[PDB]
Amino acid sequence: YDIQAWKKQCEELLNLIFQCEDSEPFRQPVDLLEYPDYRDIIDTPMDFATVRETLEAGNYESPMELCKDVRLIFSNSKAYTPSKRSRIYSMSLRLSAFFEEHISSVLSDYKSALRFHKR
Ligand SMILES: Cc1cc(Cn2nc(C)ccc2=O)on1
Numbered sequence: 001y002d003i004q005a006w007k008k009q010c011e012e013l014l015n016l017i018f019q020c021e022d023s024e025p026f027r028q029p030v031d032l033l034e035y036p037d038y039r040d041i042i043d044t045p046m047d048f049a050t051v052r053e054t055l056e057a058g059n060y061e062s063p064m065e066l067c068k069d070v071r072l073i074f075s076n077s078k079a080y081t082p083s084k085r086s087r088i089y090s091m092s093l094r095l096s097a098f099f100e101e102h103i104s105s106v107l108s109d110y111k112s113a114l115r116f117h118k119r
Contacts, residue, residue, distance in 0.1 A: 001116040002109075006063040007055065009106045013099070014052050020098065022091040023048060026073050030080075041080050046072040063106050070099055 017023045029047050030038050038045070051069050060066045074096045081089035 001113040003113045003117055005113070006106050006110040007060075009109075010055055010060075010063055010066050011052075013102050013106070014048065014055070016102070017048060017095065017099065018052075020095060022095040022098075025088045025091060026077070026095070030076075035080070038080065042076050044072060044076070046070075046076060048073065063103070063110050067103055067107065070103075071096075074099075 018027065027048050029045055029050070030042075032038055046069050048070075051066060051073075054060055054069065055066060074092050077089050077092035083089070
């Protein structure tokens with residue numbers, strides 16, 4: 001029932017994501033010089049360095065907020081892909097499965113801890 005435990009758990013999961021080869025296209029903001037129409041398709045760019053920085057700055061109140069930003073990385077990849085068979089989009093689907101597999105217990109533990117706090 002540790003209300004704060006999610007933060008270190010998210011730091012560790014981000015470290016695992018950074019060591020994954022599938023995260024390479026998502027580690028830094030999408031290069032607007034290489035994809036000049038990116039902002040015509042994507043309203044809110046997101047990447048894993050921005051997520052890690054937001055977490056380290058103490059600018060996430062809960063793992064749900066972190067999860068919303070990570071999911072935005074994947075939805076942006078899906079929205080920008082010209083094909084569901086593209087390399088970057090295919091990497092995003094594997095990385096998303098890995099993320100969802102690991103974030104589930106973090107969210108469950110946090111919500112359980114908060115319910116215990118308000119019992
Ligand atoms: C994340 C992310 C990276 C890209 C942009 N992109 N990158 C390459 C190498 C080829 C096609 C292409 O669309 O789009 N979202």
